[PDB]
Amino acid sequence: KFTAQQHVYDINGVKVGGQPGEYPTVLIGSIFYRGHKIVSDGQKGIFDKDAAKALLDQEAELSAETGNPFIIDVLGESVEALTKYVEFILENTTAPFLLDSISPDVRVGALKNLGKDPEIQKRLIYNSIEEHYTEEELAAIKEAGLKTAVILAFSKKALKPNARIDLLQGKDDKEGLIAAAKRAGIEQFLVDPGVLDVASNSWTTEAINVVKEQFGYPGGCAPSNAVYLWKKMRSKGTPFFEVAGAAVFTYPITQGADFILYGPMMNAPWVYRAIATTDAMIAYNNKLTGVKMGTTEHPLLKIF
Amino acid sequence: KFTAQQHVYDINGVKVGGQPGEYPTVLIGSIFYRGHKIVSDGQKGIFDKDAAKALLDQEAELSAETGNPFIIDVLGESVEALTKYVEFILENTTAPFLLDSISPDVRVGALKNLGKDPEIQKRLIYNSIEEHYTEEELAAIKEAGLKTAVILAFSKKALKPNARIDLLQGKDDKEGLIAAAKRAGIEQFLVDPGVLDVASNSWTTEAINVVKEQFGYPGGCAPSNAVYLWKKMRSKGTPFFEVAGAAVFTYPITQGADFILYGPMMNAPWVYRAIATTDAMIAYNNKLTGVKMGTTEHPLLKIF
Ligand SMILES: CN1c2c(O)nc(N)nc2NC[C@@H]1CNc1ccc(C(=O)N[C@@H](CCC(=O)O)C(=O)O)cc1
Ligand code: NA
Ligand code: NA
């Protein structure tokens, strides 16, 4: 149990945050990521609408089966592409989504196109306010009227978990990431301490623990970051890659994390089954602890 | 990190126990279990020795790959069979092994057949000292001069973790299982709180935690039966069954457990890959917990 009262955000019906076992893990699958075979032109955003819809429908079905809610990680390499991807996602699912790009300018340009749309304020989560945030980024976020952001509380200057306190709150003459986000009008903060490689997932989970223990923000991470590039394991094929991936993806949940970016959506069928199992066992512990489940739509009550 | 000074046993070269990240998880696969198809006659103990040897060779190869040590769970349904299986295991692997039957009469009979033998004393772990123990059984153990036993707190009269601790440590007019084992001359206790079902694997793990917190004995469990009786998930096939399995099997390790009985040895190729991944992440945490690795034969140093 965490000492700070936990923030539980309701993002278009998706509950994120809470004490361990209160709410199911929110699963965040990537679409239109680099090399995604349903994209034929990543600059113009030419993509397979039927295939994308099938992924979204599959996500909805797996979510209905296990009780794990979902937020879509929408990636783009160009303003044109990401704008089109977001338009498609708004139309073809109800889920919140991350506005995501390796390049901040792509996120900024996409926000200008999408505009201060009330639906965008409700369902678009800015991914992310990072160490090297710019003023034009904060201006774009404010002009779009966004209310929820991922705070990527990661730096090579703050490798230790306790150093996330410094990143979020600020230190010396440096504005904290929470302060920066608030200046941009953000009111809900999903804290992601970042993942470098598979092993370092344990440090990321410790950071999540610090953040929940001291501030009560929802904490999560992207364990997929080094898993898909782990060729030694992936080249082994099924089911070796999936069980290795399952070990990585479930680990933060076992230490009280609230959300996981599990990588390409095509992996959802095995990811949901692994994560739901972990959630079930954690929630069963509530019987001893006295923690009450926030919802009846929980893996514990669904997967057996 | 656990409160009590941890007992680390050296079971004929296999280290088991310690603080999280100190030693790799010990993996314990079952051979000659009920319905194991390499067995042509379970009453007489007639089996395909080449197929059995192939399993043992595979275990050694997987162990060499990840750094996870292995102890073989040797099951038998008759005194005749189990005696032959133990003789085979002694000459076809160097590893320690569990003398295992659901029938106490079978364990005791086999053990009597094995006599007083330094190799048996070094390699044979009695599975298990459990609630139905008899003075005959304790005397047979003492006569064999065994030094290590699995202490199994599986009981439908002890569901909650604290009730399992009561079974282990004694309460009221019961000496408890640890005390019973000591009377049999056991000096090393591999504590297995039992797995009642998949969801209650978290209670199993809580019991392991209390054992390590208060006594410092190595703790582990055997979730394979619970996983194989999970019809809903098993019906989904591969790789869904395996990733669910992996979530269950790795969960206790994420909470500091020392060993897992992972079920049939045929499942070793995926179990080792999942467990090694968890071990790698936990050992990476060692700086944060103030733990030192007790060996360089550790997944963190092998699987990347
Ligand atoms: C960087 N990381 C990340 C993070 O750590 N935190 C936030 N908030 N957001 C994000 N967004 C993107 C990413 C998480 N999602 C991912 C992570 C990794 C992959 C991935 O490895 N894709 C593969 C290609 C796909 C494949 O091989 O199947 C690659 O080589 O790039 C795909 C998506
Ligand atoms: Na949760
Ligand atoms: Na094997």
Residue numbers in the entry:
A (entry chain A), B (entry chain B): 3 to 306
What is the paper's account of this structure, in its own sentences?
During energy production in Desulfitobacterium hafniense, MtgA catalyzes the methyl transfer from methylcobalamin (Cbl‐CH3) to THF in the catabolism of glycine betaine (GB). Despite its lack of sequence identity with known structures, we could show that MtgA forms a homodimeric complex of two TIM barrels. The topology of each subunit is characterized by a funnel of eight parallel β‐sheets connected by α‐helices on the outside that form a complex of two perpendicularly oriented TIM barrels. The active‐site cavity is located inside the hydrophilic core of each barrel.
Herein, we present X‐ray structures of THF‐ and THF‐CH3‐bound MtgA that allow us atomic insights into the reaction trajectory of this catalyst. In contrast to substrate‐bound MtgA, the entire cofactor is defined in the MtgA:THF‐CH3 complex depicting extensive coordination within the amino acid environment in a rigid manner. The overall binding motif of the pterin ring remains similar to the substrate‐bound structure. However, the THF benzoate moiety is now involved in a π‐stacking network including Tyr230, Phe243, Phe251, and Trp272 on one side, as well as Tyr35 and His38 on the other. While the functional groups of the THF tail engage water‐coupled hydrogen bonding interactions with adjacent residues, the terminal γ‐carboxylate forms salt bridges with Arg236 that coordinate the cofactor in an extended conformation. Besides this fixation, the superposition of both ligand structures illustrates a rotation of the pterin moiety during the reaction of approximately 35°. In contrast, the benzoate group of THF‐CH3 displaces the carboxamide side chain of Asn227 by 2 Å (red double arrow). As planar sp2 hybridization would be expected in this position of the final product THF‐CH3, the X‐ray structure must depict a trapped protonated reaction intermediate. Notably, the active site lacks residues to deprotonate the (THF‐CH3)+ intermediate; this decreases the conjugated electron system within the pterin ring system. On the other hand, the WT MtgA:THF‐CH3 structure illustrates an intermediate that forms immediately after CH3 transfer from Cbl‐CH3 to THF.
